[PDB]
């Protein structure tokens, strides 16, 4: 179509930036004017995409109700900032991350179409009924009941009283789900008139350096619990304990920015430790990948055809662990209760199983078939005048 103004809105939280960079870059490359509203803390990632950075102050940075109150604070703060920025420069369409749903409220006010960009699997209108007891019990707590009242008041004050607080956020008008259908739990209940499974939006190798397998190491393992809170030194010691006594294997242990404390005496010759690694480069030579099970790591494992040992912890991860195990390409463990032989058995068995390798090749072909960046950009352009 004609140029047109596309407005992307997201949040500075780490899982909500990388999934769509290549999509925004593609929309810019197609000659559109793309503005990207986000917190200035992630100005580097936003500007590298080529879109026009529209700064706003995010309220996102130890209780479940308190965590919901922080999100509602961010929604209350985001909407007036978005309104002020775009009042005289209204876009043809609003693209918004799952946590940037105030952009949809703004789009409803101005009669502008909106498209949700979901970085992980969505919750279909059947997943929510299973959670209805949890929601009702929350409403019995005065803190919970106060929260839902403030949420409803914000909708009414913002000019969208006709929509439920759940439907806004989790029942978007249109949604691009940046995961393959085989990583979406209960894909049966997802209405694909509304949600489109795009898969990852890729756009050529990110570089960041090349990693070559050390000569004399027959198999390579990467341990990277890349969910920010990688504060497990006891598990890291189990990993070195396993791969030390596992010659012919080379362990690349990514411990995270928060540590590098108390390693060994220089470590066994098997282990090389980093605070951060070029993950895609290491996975290129990896025979197994140990991750928390975040959507980013799992899709990177699938893309590289590397079997995974999954240690789910955060809210997203348990279902992700179930999916990859259900696909027959992964083993699930608990960091608290995992044993050196138990961890070693999963590593050696997964890497040597030829049926596991064959399933990975199939998932690689299935993965790209969802359309990716080009299909997502084409769908967005259908919304332009």
């Amino acid at each position: 179509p004609r140029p047109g103004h596309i407005a992307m809105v997201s949040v500075p939280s780490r899982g909500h930036l990388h999934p769509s960079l290549e999509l925004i870059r593609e929309l810019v490359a197609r000659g559109h004017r793309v503005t990207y509203a986000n917190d200035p803390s992630v100005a580097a990632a936003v500007t590298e995409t080529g879109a026009e950075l529209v700064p706003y102050t995010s309220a996102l940075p130890t209780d479940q109700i308190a965590q919901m109150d922080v999100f509602l604070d961010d929604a209350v703060g985001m909407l007036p900032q978005l309104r002020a920025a775009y009042e005289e420069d209204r876009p043809d369409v609003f693209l918004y991350d799952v946590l940037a749903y105030p952009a949809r409220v703004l789009a409803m006010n101005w009669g502008i179409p909106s498209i949700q960009i979901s970085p992980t699997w969505v919750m279909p209108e059947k997943y929510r009924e299973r959670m209805a007891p949890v929601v009702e019990q929350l409403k019995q707590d005065p803190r919970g009941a106060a929260h839902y009242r403030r949420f409803d008041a914000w909708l009414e004050d913002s000019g969208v009283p006709g929509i439920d607080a759940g439907d806004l956020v989790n029942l978007p008008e249109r949604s691009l789900v940046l995961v393959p259908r085989f990583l979406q739990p209960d894909a049966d209940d997802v209405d694909e008139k509304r949600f489109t499974f795009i898969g990852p939006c890729l756009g050529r190798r990110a570089h960041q350096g090349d990693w070559k397998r050390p000569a004399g190491a027959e198999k390579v393992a990467l341990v990277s619990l890349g969910s920010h809170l990688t504060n497990q030194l006891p598990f890291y010691e189990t990993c070195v304990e396993v791969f030390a006594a596992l010659p012919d294997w080379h362990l690349v242990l990514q411990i995270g920015r928060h540590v590098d404390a108390g390693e060994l005496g220089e470590l066994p010759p098997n282990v090389e430790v980093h605070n951060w690694v070029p993950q895609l480069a290491v996975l290129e030579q990896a025979d197994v990948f140990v991750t928390h099970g975040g959507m980013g790591g799992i899709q990177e494992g699938l893309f590289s055809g590397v079997p995974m040992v999954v240690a789910p912890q955060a809210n997203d991860q348990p279902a992700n662990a179930e999916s990859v195990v259900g696909l027959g390409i992964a083993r699930r463990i608990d960091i608290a209760t995992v044993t050196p032989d138990r961890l070693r058995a999963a590593v050696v068995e997964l890497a040597s199983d030829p049926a596991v390798a064959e399933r990975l090749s199939g998932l690689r072909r299935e993965l790209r078939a969802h359309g990716g960046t080009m299909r997502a950009a084409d769908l967005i352009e259908r919304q332009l005048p």
Partner: peptide
């Protein structure tokens, strides 16, 4: 929401 609550944050 912690575990994904679906009916909110």
């Amino acid at each position: 929401x912690x575990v994904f609550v679906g009916g909110x944050x």
